[PDB]
Design a protein around this ligand. Structure first.
Ligand SMILES: [Mg+2]
Ligand SMILES: [Mg+2]
Ligand SMILES: [Mg+2]
Ligand SMILES: [Mg+2]
Ligand SMILES: [Mg+2]
Ligand SMILES: [Mg+2]
Ligand SMILES: [Mg+2]
Ligand SMILES: [Mg+2]
Ligand SMILES: [Mg+2]
Ligand SMILES: [Mg+2]
Ligand SMILES: [Mg+2]
Ligand SMILES: [Mg+2]
Ligand SMILES: [Mg+2]
Ligand SMILES: [Mg+2]
Ligand SMILES: [Mg+2]
Ligand SMILES: [Mg+2]
Lengths: 117, 109, 55, 119
RNA sequence: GGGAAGCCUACCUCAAGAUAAGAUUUCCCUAGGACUUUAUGUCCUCUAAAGAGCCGUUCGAGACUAGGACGUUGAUAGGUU
RNA sequence: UGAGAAGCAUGCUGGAGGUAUCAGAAGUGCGAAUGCUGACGUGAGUAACGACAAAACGGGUGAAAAACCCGUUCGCCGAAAGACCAAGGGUUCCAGUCCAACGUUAAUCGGGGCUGGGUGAGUCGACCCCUAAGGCGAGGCCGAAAGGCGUAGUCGAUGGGA
RNA sequence: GAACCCACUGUCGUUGAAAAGCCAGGGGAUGACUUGUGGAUAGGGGUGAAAGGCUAAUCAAGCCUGGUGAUAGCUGGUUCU
RNA sequence: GUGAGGGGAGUGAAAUAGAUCCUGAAACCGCAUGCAUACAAGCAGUGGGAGCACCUUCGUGGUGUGACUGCGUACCUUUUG
RNA sequence: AGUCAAGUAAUUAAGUGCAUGUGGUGGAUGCCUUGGCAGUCAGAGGCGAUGAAAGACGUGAUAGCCUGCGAAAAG
């Protein structure tokens, strides 16, 4: 019962090489480099799936700070006022409004400032 | 559309023939022939033979006029290489490869 | 001395990018009306109104 | 550095170069039309024209000098009897060098050397 | 305020790829159509300017290049005197 | 489509085998061992193109001539780079025809491919007669066997004989 | 001091023309000389004007075939979820 | 070039079944189209992301390229590392 | 309409990178056998001085090689 390793090995190598399309140099032609490239890409994806949330939260905080300083406040003071005013709107909707709806963000800042006083 | 002509077994490497083949890509048949006649390269005579064969085929089989023809596409492919042994110093031996190439020329219009 | 790593095909082509050929100066003769190299004698033996190898 | 230097080497020694130039001059005087390389053709003038200039006067000393420089009795005879009187009133320029393409053997530029009033 | 062969200028050379790409003087290019996605839009017809290059005779320039002079309105190279 | 090793359907080539489910046996999964075999890259169109002497021109054939053929000049060896035997190799010797491969380039040329020819002995040499060093060895001596030595003899030129 | 034999110095060569060479110099050159042909000595043996030198480009024990798939407390490698 | 090689015609179910002759993969080497690229530094990827070019079951769609940007010093063995 | 100044778009590819289409060298895979490997059941277990095992040279298509044969020589 002799078994030949042609078909299944060729199929595995073909799948590995197809999973690495678009890379530069031997990373798209040679199997030995393509395997390491695919593994490194998987690890980088696993790490960036965590880093993305921090990046977007920082972006939202920066935009909210810009809006609050435009409306004569700071990020810390506005967040403290909104927490004291019983407002539970998250930072995503706040940044969206600050970027798009100026009068709504002005009203929110006025409510936060009134709650601070 | 394209009248083709192939020359196999040119007894020259592809790297030396591509330099000549790059000169006549896109030119007219008359300008290409004039360029190939007054050159001193070795692959020039082979490219000229292939071009004349293509033009003759276009004239005879497809019945196309010669003044409207131009070098539409042209390329060189690798071929079978012969392997020989060269004796070096101190009893060592090296492998020499005599290279060969094929020329493909398609004239259009 | 010998290289420590392979040279990718990109660097090879970048180096070969100066290996292009050039055309010669060909003009039409005023007397015979044939294409010939400038400042050179025509293959039949004619140059500048004169004719060598009289037949 | 070869500032203001005149002469050629052609990958030859002094004696070989001198003998080759003498043989070229003799062949040109015999056949009146030769085909050689371009630098050899351009350098042949400086050795061919002085001989024709010397042959314009028919004396024993001039004949002996032409024989010492050519070492060919037939060449000296043909010179002093034909080419001397032919270029009697011409002020130099007895040769004509015309480029004739390249050699098929080694892609060397060729040239035709001709007399101005042959045949 | 004075204060050294020390630093910056001063002397010679290079230098606007200084992407911050500078300045000055002079010279050259001023037509007729079709279509669309009306835009320094795309295909046609008609001319190729001032200049640069190819080529040739050459150098006190030069590895190859580059640079300087000349090409019948010519003394650029050879020959002759 | 599933968490995965993987499964399913189908577009193009291919032209004759493949195999459900459940059981059984494995030469049953490769990226490395300065692993083995074959092919192909970098170096790279880079080095190199092989003592003492040197080449130039006119004509011929030929698709193509610096290398071939003919002729005219130059140069080198000449106690050899000239002319022959022994050993060694067997057709490389001559004629006709060809340039796919070989010739450190091309080749119309060749010690390259194909076809056909060529070696004539009483006096040359070999064969033959004789023998040196040495080999073998009837009987014989010795030795577990194989075998070792050796007499009469028989072979053995680098020598002697028309 | 030639042929011939040998190899003291220097240059070049070191993937060389050459797995020990070329060139310029050097020593012996009627003898303890050089050389052709045919034989003898075979591996714990032979030979050696003696260097552990030579014994088919291999010598502090030649080569080939078998015990043999010797042994290695050592180094390397060991494949799907 | 009375060469090699190729284009027509024809045979053949099939000639990228043409004698280097079933199917014919990868490394390696050309041609064409689409996008990006000549003031900006590093295991060459990953998470975002404007524009451009062809498709359409015309979209808070598909297929390619992807300027700009945060993070990021290969794999296996042997080692405390 | 025009000059001047400031600011700011588009336009280049000697070459290269990525994706797709079309080719070349290359001989893995798929299918097949003309060859091997291991056994069972029955035989036989030898050839030769009447010249053995193994070889050299010859014999027809036409020149060679492989088989057959031996001057009576593919009989
Ligand atoms: Mg001068
Ligand atoms: Mg296995
Ligand atoms: Mg493998
Ligand atoms: Mg591993
Ligand atoms: Mg060099
Ligand atoms: Mg000749
Ligand atoms: Mg023969
Ligand atoms: Mg012959
Ligand atoms: Mg022969
Ligand atoms: Mg005995
Ligand atoms: Mg006897
Ligand atoms: Mg002496
Ligand atoms: Mg900058
Ligand atoms: Mg830029
Ligand atoms: Mg990404
Ligand atoms: Mg027969």
């Amino acid at each position: 019962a002799r078994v030949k390793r042609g078909v299944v090995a060729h199929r595995r190598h073909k799948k590995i090489l197809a999973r690495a399309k678009g890379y530069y140099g031997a990373r798209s032609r040679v199997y030995r480099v393509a395997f390491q490239a695919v593994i490194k890409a998987g690890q980088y994806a696993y790490r960036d799936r965590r880093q993305k949330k921090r990046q977007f939260r920082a972006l939202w905080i920066a935009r909210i700070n810009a809006g609050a300083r435009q409306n004569g406040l700071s990020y810390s003071r506005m967040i403290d006022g909104l927490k004291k005013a019983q407002v539970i709107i998250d930072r995503r909707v706040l940044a969206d409004i600050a970027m798009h709806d100026a009068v709504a963000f002005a009203a929110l800042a006025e409510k936060a400032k009134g709650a601070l006083a | 559309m394209e009248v083709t002509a192939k020359l196999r077994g040119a007894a020259i490497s592809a790297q030396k023939a591509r330099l000549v083949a790059d000169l006549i890509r896109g030119k007219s048949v008359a300008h290409a022939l004039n360029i190939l006649n007054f050159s001193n390269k070795k692959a020039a005579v082979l490219v000229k033979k292939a071009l004349e064969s293509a033009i003759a085929n276009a004239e005879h089989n497809n019945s196309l006029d010669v003044d409207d023809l131009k070098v539409s596409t042209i390329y060189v492919d690798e071929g079978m290489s012969l392997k020989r042994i060269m004796p070096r110093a101190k009893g060592r031996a090296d492998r020499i490869t005599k290279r060969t190439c094929h020329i493909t020329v398609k004239v259009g219009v | 001395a010998v290289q420590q790593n392979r040279k990718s095909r990109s660097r090879r082509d970048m180096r070969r990018s100066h290996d292009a050929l050039t055309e010669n100066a060909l003009t039409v003769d005023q007397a015979t009306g044939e294409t010939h190299r400038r400042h050179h004698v025509t293959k039949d033996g004619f140059y500048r109104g004169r004719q060598l190898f009289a037949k | 550095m070869r500032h203001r230097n005149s002469g050629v080497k052609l990958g030859r020694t002094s004696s070989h170069r001198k003998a080759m130039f003498e043989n070229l001059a003799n062949s040109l005087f015999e056949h009146e039309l030769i085909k050689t390389t371009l630098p050899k053709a351009k350098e042949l003038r400086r050795v061919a024209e002085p001989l024709i200039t010397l042959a314009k006067n028919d004396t024993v000393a001039n004949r002996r000098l032409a024989f010492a420089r050519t070492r060919n009795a037939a060449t000296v005879g043909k010179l002093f009897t034909v080419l001397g009187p032919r270029y009697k009133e011409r002020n130099g320029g007895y040769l004509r060098v015309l480029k004739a393409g390249f050699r098929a053997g080694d892609a060397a530029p060729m040239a035709y050397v001709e007399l101005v009033d042959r045949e």
